[model samples]
Target chain A: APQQINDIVHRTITPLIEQQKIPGMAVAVIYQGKPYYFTWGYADIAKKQPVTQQTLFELGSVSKTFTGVLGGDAIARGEIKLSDPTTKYWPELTAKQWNGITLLHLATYTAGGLPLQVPDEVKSSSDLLRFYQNWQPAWAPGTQRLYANSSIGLFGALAVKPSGLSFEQAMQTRVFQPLKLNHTWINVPPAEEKNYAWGYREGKAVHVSPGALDAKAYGVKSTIEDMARWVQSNLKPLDINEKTLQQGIQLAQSRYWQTGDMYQGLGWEMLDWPVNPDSIIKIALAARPVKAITPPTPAVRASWVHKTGATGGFGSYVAFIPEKELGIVMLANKNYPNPARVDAAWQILNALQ
Target chain B: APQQINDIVHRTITPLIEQQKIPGMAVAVIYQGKPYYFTWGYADIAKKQPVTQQTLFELGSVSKTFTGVLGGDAIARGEIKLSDPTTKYWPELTAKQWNGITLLHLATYTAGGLPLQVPDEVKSSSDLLRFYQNWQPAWAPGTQRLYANSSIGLFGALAVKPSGLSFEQAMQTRVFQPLKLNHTWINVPPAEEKNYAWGYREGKAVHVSPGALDAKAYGVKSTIEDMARWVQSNLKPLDINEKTLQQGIQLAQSRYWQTGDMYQGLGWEMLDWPVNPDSIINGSDNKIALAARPVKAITPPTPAVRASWVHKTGATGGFGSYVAFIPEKELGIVMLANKNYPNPARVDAAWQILNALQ
Candidate 1:
């Protein structure tokens, strides 16, 4: 029962906060498509504010997952192709610098060596264009992986163009509103700001400092309850009314690149199921140089699909096992280490298993 | 012995990374005013870049400590006064809303409760002045603490004005250069960009995205080596050649407001020395409050006290940092990570290292 689940969650999280002194954490677990929630500590500790169902935690780069799904929706709509070069939509990127790079390469961080951030010099769209125009690839596209906001940001920027809406509006209209993920936000409006959790870094509170492509790259804020629903949607996409949106989410979940032990989906990172925690850490920590596999590997068996996200102060993790039909979303106000997030989620999932 | 120290650091940090999967971390510990450095993991995991002595990590709000010290220097030079209303130097602020607010209140985050960050509506200086002018105080200045970027940012901006330089230039000219903080930067020039480490968040690389007052409030970038020197300067300010800079550092370190169990200095927070890890955790954790923390003034203010643990915490979107020192022990610790890890972990790690030093 939920009480039993709460006990299990409490037993695991209590010691963690005591040891790390984390101010707040919220967990949502999906079992056989059923949902359970447990919240502890404070959203605003100084006010002695307690965590509630509505408290929104910044999802950081996990936002890319949403963008990746948006692309899937676009592809499903025949508005863009995964194989199309970014220049097709974002024609300002000179053909000389970007002709060979595809939307797939941009989504997967395989576009030769786009840095982690859009370089600071690129203050405007014109600056981004100039930077890309002068940029040279360190390696050929699709041959290597370097996880970056710039690559995925470009993908989201270009992929959403045909919709004739801002990236934020496109996501609201196409993704969150359709999936019924009601609480997710790209630009959290004023009314909802009260529900947004303040992220803690080194004991001081902070908010994400938005920059170029930040909204599309690492700007999502969400709650545990909404995220649990998102996980459920991933577990069973056909339940949704929007068929193309469903197909898009499915497309995003499909594997495209193999980097040693880890598989790359649009925004999700997948590991072979029945995998050990150490293996998850190893694969997560391992270098992500890539090779595009032919007839992209099909998910014939259970795989551990997950994504981790963080702003300067917040930390988030989401994972689901397809065969077991189990999913978990963990959100914390403080940016704790990723391994602990993985280990905690892994431990809870195992206890249930 | 060096190997033993490495083992101690590894013992503390190894399990941390193994458990948390941190991409890269660099540590600098000062033992008897001598420095020891240890690094692990990659600055850029995808490129297989390793953490090195020269690697620059974002100091986050720890940069606030430097700004606080810059305030001290400005005070030392008679260019600014801690008691003066901000409207004195910054005529932009309407005295109607800001009459009672002083430079000290801004530095200590006691200026009647400013938000932690400048609201998004504030895009430029004019916007900031308008916001401050229109902003009503929740309580009397110096009576309550609200740790905020907007407050400290105002302090740094106005305090450096008499020097006739931009806040960035003022910091470089008045603070970093005088103290020989060559590797420290308010705006890291292009020549130094290569050494600037790529910060990681959720297994992906990130860097600080500059926002309004971000440089003054939380935008300094420095390496462990330079930070060690900074810690050294904090420990023995008397040894520095520039007496005024030394005095300024001391001035910033003074205890001005006592909030609950913690004392507020300009940039640093203070706790009774021989502090336990739990106390440091309590003192540091959840300082950012929706309601202001009730604070009592230390009348006439106390000069820098030796029997205390002086510290500050900073994090950008991609990096997490902690710096702490015991004046009596002549010991200090600096932990800079490309990822913004938890503060309690940093305190606990430093606590273990402190115990080992003993």
Candidate 2:
């Protein structure tokens, strides 16, 4: 590990401490397939307990990557064809208007016409189907891009359904068993309830109350060790087939859809780090001002394929550099309002390179 | 029972069969504490089975009365004060601007706010809190009336919190237990899951997925027998204190707000049945024409107060009913339907009474 990278982590992490916010954070940096781990701040700010590798945090949107992994694994097993239209399995989806959309379009956020959030008039699953049936596409498929929970969530649901397996079962049979990452789960089972981490808001320990979309999109909860193992899988191209490995890497690298200088592919986005101009890798950043929400007049291009997970009080970021063969995973108990981990992780990756 | 009423029941019910729709219906009429019951139609439209008193149905908006009973029970136990602001209990109630609004205002649907449908932006309860906090009042409190699920749901949540009990628990302890009505429940517990009547749409069994409002507002499931027991409680006040009884009657009668010609008192509505103009009792008619989305006007008021009945209507796919009672006449009636026909009970009761009298 470079001293310059350590200096950058210290500098970025100081403000969060000064503000007396953010309970704990666990970070890991991969250099040449070796891991450099760091645990900082408190797991419980009031209790003055320092964060450890054991301190589990809610992995928000980072859960989507796991869903992606599950999908990729299913594709490898011949359980599903990615290019198939979603309606082939769910026959209730007889609506002619949505005929052109495919599973790939949904997974990649290229389903041009889907809404970011469903309206209240949709009360049940049938209502959701009805909404989609009557839905008119605002943009043609694979044309313009919009980050929608419904798009990605429906993709995950479709993947699980075609595999003839429940979501929890698929994760266990394919990814968990192969990877040997025991700490991860889709719905936290009853046995693991004792080790469950409590999310906090305004100094109070909060429970994970998942909304419909989060339950469908980012329901996975795991530890840094399991996530690092997941990252290790990303590094070893030999462990996965050439087609799948290439597809996975392409998903993390391809410019399928652009948000400012960043391009979203599969389940990740590539964006340039704001702090380090020299860094060229996909680093997951939280609440990083994207061009769609904020204009790119100043020309801040996203340099990395990034994904962040946030639900209740827990927030996490995971990023990988395909060119450098490096990855970083950061999990935190408290929700830090900025994308600090992405920058800090990038600084470390830049030093390693 | 009048012979004229039986003739009318035959005339009205035979058409439902001729139309090749709706399996079975159970019709009951109570006049002077006596019930004249009639069963017509089938429980299973496909199976050609006749309806019975025991066949359960999902009591849709009619569940509101049970929720109201929970609220009344809470108030009776001095667990909640209706005049108190809702924020007193749910201090985390993010709606800062709605500080002036009380629990009474919400229960009466006079909060002058938007309807509680699935909101476009809010998918969770926290999102609902955020939406309400930022919401601007459309009309002044207790001014104009808009029948909405949002206000009632919020009211139910508020009512339950003060009692240190959930809406379900409060209903069981206060109403269900006291009346010995074991069949009715807000949420079908695991043990009773098998008894749940399957809701149908497009001729297939379906699940009655709870709407956002139903999570708090109208959530009870019941059978005709249990509902009749509830109606009996409404007809004859029993095992309740004078204060509790008076308050319950006040909730049933005290008109705090009006939506068109329909006056709302707590969970109950006072309306003149348009179908039988002469019978002015307040009946919970699940008739779309009576509780029309944009309510219609009633021409002439009924002659007697006894005829001016108090009613409640419910519709949840497989189960629907119109429960009306005239206190002065000591008359209570319930008409339960399994199919989705708008409101067949009123026509059935009209036919039944016409035939019985003739």
Candidate 3:
């Protein structure tokens, strides 16, 4: 069965590079509570470098998951509450629109139609203040889920307010260090620069470009093996010394909104287990508003908890089904299409069964 | 991004099914060498059977694509040539008006001028022969592109002559069967009746009504999954595994005439990659399909190339369909709705979803 597993992984990943224009890929599967790693193609095509377990690939929006965990840790430590109003953390925003806004709204993207990206014209802290002060809710708060980096970024920022430390410092102090993810880093150390994988886009090597919400939204980079551990942790509690962080991880996974078959967690998306790759993609590209379900439905036993992320050159996907004790981490050098990523992951999961 | 894509597809499709009164839709997207199928609503609202991958939707004029490929297959088999005169296939029409017409001209809708539909007065083979013999050029052959069923129907008829079979049989033997497209048929069989969708035409359930040249021009019915397979073959013709078939597929996709930035292939129309959905909607206006537009011949045809949007749109009184794919992106979309909504609405909904796929 393990050999069959390897064959399935090979059949799936080989087509990605051979026909889909992806230069390289690092894949990890957790089955029966054990980790399996597969690496293929070139990390740097021009140099003919094969990808390895240590290749540090950009996590992009997958970083949002970690931020959610960090925020959850804060909530677990009694530093905050889901019902805490946004003004409690930052009183500067005296606008009436901020009155009904809460940390829960920001976490779930139900803060009333926030745009996906923070506008480029707002360049400074004062500009951010002005933007928020003048911005009005496009819909009533808590009625619609409009995904936005700006909202999550604010949630990350406010979640760290009680800690009296920088956002990155708070994340490391509360989340990464405590969880013992030695390979994951918001700022890859100079000593590990050699292990960082080159991201290929359109035949050119490119790195993650800094954006308005870079730190909170899409800033982390980690290795395939490290992400495997992350998936395992999300699957169940790890041997981390701190139990409070586990509580926070639980909080992050709690359901907040329901849009048809999909449920919104703090950062992760929970889908029904028997889902098609096309259904996953159809939900992923939605641009309209979704309302929160009253009395959020209890998390079902058979559900797929997942997140997809990509920088300009790198693509990342992570999924775990707790009841099945199965998880997968797929990282690629090129930002390939989401359907391809979903289909490849689905094939491996289905094959494992 | 999967959630975002799901949201986009939902937002786009929700309004269409709700506001446009489209009872059901089966959409397939082939993204980066993988095919995914999505279905919504019902195949038969009266029966309340939900649409599924098995649901067969009317292809409407999209059936012409199959006829085009069959013609190309014949050309590849050395049974015919693009330059062969229509007279060579049927010597009965030796009229001076038919002197300049060739297989290429007919396939590209450039045989001087042909009406979008066959004349209702032509009730028999003799009358059809008389109508063509008396038909005069509105413009010189190959000078203008007048999208017409009459021209392609004639082309389909001539392309099948060497096989000594009906046009449907030729398509089945030369194209559909060889392509392994079991779910595509010029005539839906009785065994497949359960899978066929009841198209909603203004709140009434209807199925395709038989008509003249229906098999040759506007009669194919297909499942979204089968359509996705067809798209994948177009993206990678070598997958067909037969050199002759590959050449035929290539011939069908080759650029033959140019009108502005829009180019004409046998059954598919070509546009540069990265096309906006609105542009397709604007170009699909009634006038564009209804009026004769001047075109310049490519002289020597260009081989099939990626980095192009190869697409065709189809509509019947009861159904609407759109098929588009970008070869370079390895992305394709086929949208089948059981209602005759406006063309722009279908183009907009499908385009919005396809844009985010990459």
Candidate 4:
């Protein structure tokens, strides 16, 4: 790894700690499938206890990727197809309109007309069915899009139902077992209460809001080591089957829709290389092109996959450059709003590349 | 008031308390501009105490009317106009594409076509302005309608901003003061903490949700006596100017939009009556016609105005109702149920009207 990469990481993270007033952060970088770990700040600010690599922060929405992996793993197992109608598993979905919607659509946020969250009317399984029955599409399915947590949440919920295990248990059996990623959890067990980082809001410590945990959008809580390993898996698609892995990579890497230059893929976002003027591409690029790459300039363009997680006060950013066989993970105990995490990740990625 | 009407009230109250296991209720009736009050059940079920005329129930969305009334009163006081664009009071509304939308359109639920509630992106007042500024109406303003609490809440929030008082304080001074309704409040004061009713869910008490108080849809709390006075004012339309009262009534009574037979007025809903079979006029009569007559049987083609009653329902921890005469009946009925019964007003109103006619 480049020696200057450590300096770049320190510079980007130090400001985030001060600005976001985050208590702790865990970072990991994978270069050519090799991992380097760093820990900074304090786990408990009141105690003035410095953070260690093992200190846990609630993973927030990062859990969704685990769900995505589990869904992908199921497709590998031949238990379900991504294009199958959700009604097949949860048969109460009698509404003909919803019958046309598929599990893949739910995962990709291509269900077209669902709201960002489940309607208040969906109090139970039956209520959920009724909601789907009454739901009228705002746009053509798979044409328009909205980032709906409920669709993904329901997808995960349904995935577990067919396997006859609770969502957490099913996730453990499938994704966790295969990946060998420990220290990650869907529902934080009571025994691990002592290690949990306090979540904060508006500078005051607060509990996570109820109904924020979506197995599809957010469920896992893993350390930097586990995230780095996950990132390594993304870099080398050998473990993932050729067909399914390609599909997953396509979902992550494809510019499915453009919000400005930003493209929202399945649970991931894509952006151009060299995020900032001072940034340099090192580990992720084998041969640095002589030409300068600038924003709105398509020349020297490189593709990368990234996902952000925000829950309570905890925020996380993870990115992978498949071509360079490199990935980076950043987890913080306090949330720094949008573009901050992406910029920070890019700054570090640029230095390493 | 009809003696049978009082008996029917007692009958409805008894079963709801016994069979439904409701804890408390505050009921009021307005007949010929006179007020009659009733109470049953307990404000706190664990204490085994009975409800009183003074016991306050969470008025829920019924509070929107108080907010609506404040807007009307503000307009009457020359503090604001219904035609004023929200951008005038809240300048941050530069993003909205629907330029013609007025405060009136908002109050009437016919603003720039948006969903019933403010989108998640617009979580606070500042966000609301930003949302409106960027909002491009999917439907022509006033052409399509969506029933939402956020629009009315924003209207109340902005309408009160010009009065140099918070929305709650302005409502207290403007509407509650002049009406002499003491126990009514927008935000429950700390002093009245002991008097607050326990809100229930799934037959068990639950802490009031935070978002409940922030929005106008579910914040007001009032006792039976205060609500009776409110109903009396709705019935009599006294002390205030006829034009101003007419304006308020127009807001509460106009056929702004339709949802099935349920036409939404500004704040109130004009429900088709004779839902029950025993009424003097059956469903065959024009809904608007049946809603206007003093004598239930009086039919003259269609009356100049509908016989429809102006009504609003409140749902927070409890369920509440305010039903009143539309034109000349000068009668109003108020029902507050503690059990959060889904449609207490519909059932109770049918029973009350039937008994009154009998």
Return the top candidate by lDDT.
Answer: 1
For residue A293, give model 2's deviation from the true position in Å: 48
Q: Score the docking of each candidate (DockQ).
A: 0.00, 0.00, 0.01, 0.00
- Backbone clash pairs for candidate 1 read A312-B317, A339-B20
Put down candidate 3 lDDT per residue, B234-306, tens digits, no spaces. Answer: 8776456664576577677777888877888878888877776677877876666657888876533544656
- Where is the poorest 10-residue window by lDDT in model 3 chain A? A292-301
Cα lDDT of model 2 by residue, A1-353, tens digit: 46655665566656654563666777777767777667777666655666766656778778777676666555544455455677965678887766767776677666765766567466577777787778777766656666676788788778778667777787787667667778787777788665556777777887566455455566778877788877777655334433333233323333434454665555666664442433322223122222221000111112344687776788788877654667888787766653466565666566666
How many collisions between residues are there in candidate 4?
A: 16
lDDT of 1 by residue, B1-358 (tens): 3776777888897787666677888899888888899889888787787899988899999999999988887776657767677888888676586887888889999888888888876888778777888888888887888889999998998988888899999888878888788888878889988888999877678888868898889999998899999999998765666755766786776778787667888898887777667877655555442247888776334556666789988988899899988876888889998888777777788888876885
Q: Taking chain A of candidate 4, what TM-score results? A: 0.82
Give the TM-score of each candidate: 0.50, 0.44, 0.50, 0.44
Please tell me which model should have the higher lDDT, number 1 or number 4.
1
Show model 2 residue runs off by greater than 4 Å: A1-353, B1-5, B14-20, B41-50, B116-123, B190-194, B238-246, B272-307, B343-358
Name the better of 1 and 2 by TM-score.
Answer: 1
| Residue-wise C-alpha lDDT for candidate 4, range B1-358, written one tens digit per residue | 4686577776666665566556677777666667778887677777675678777778777777677766766654446666567777877666546576767667766675554556645565566566666666666665555555666777777887787897778777777877788888766788876677776668786534655224466677888888877766754443344434323433344344554455555566554443333331232222422132111101000111235655666666545444445334666677776666545434454455533642
Which candidate, 1 or 2, has the higher lDDT? 1
